């Protein structure tokens, strides 16, 4: 998950 940013709220 490097670079993959944030998860669905």
């Amino acid at each position, epitope marked *: *998950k*490097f*670079g*993959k*940013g*944030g*998860t*669905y*709220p």
Partner: antibody
Amino acid sequence: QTVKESGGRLVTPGGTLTLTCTVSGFSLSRYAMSWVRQAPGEGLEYIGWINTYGSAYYASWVNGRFTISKTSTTMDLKMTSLTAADTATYFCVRWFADGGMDPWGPGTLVTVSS
Amino acid sequence: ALVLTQTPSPVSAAVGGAVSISCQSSQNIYKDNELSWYQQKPGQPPKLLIYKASTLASGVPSRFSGSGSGTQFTLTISGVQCDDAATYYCQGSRYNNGWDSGFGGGTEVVVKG
């Protein structure tokens, strides 16, 4: 949160076009983005994505013909050597870490024609 | 190379009935569940319905449900309405020294009124 594509137009075969995806309501430092296209009457086709650090990755068929880059508020798709196989609606999406693509833009149409 | 294969178009359902669409991955999806479902009506952008195989996105009607893990995924519409007539797409990723992603070919749902 919104994304909006721009730049779609008639382009000559062999030509080059750059599309722009303009975002608002979220940071490109905090979310990944993707380009997806759809040929008329055909399915969604994944093109590539760009990570929060600006590293772009591509579908195996792209073969260096396309470049994805970003700014603070935009992401581009530069496309070279365009043919009729590239005629499509081009969408940008925010791509959540856990895989959901949301939101989508309205799409911009690229018509590769003489 | 990750290939996602969907139930062939078209699939039918009577209004008030139920329809199921399959999405089969050629490889195990990341965490066995990083599979999402999209609704697309003609001339509109896709809409996210479900992510992580079975979690509904904000505002999506509970008549949509997703199930499956690993390689075999199902979207089910319960109490089908005319407003559900659309093309449905799955999208999945696996990690093979980087993210390898694809869409299924889309399943058109024809609603019989």
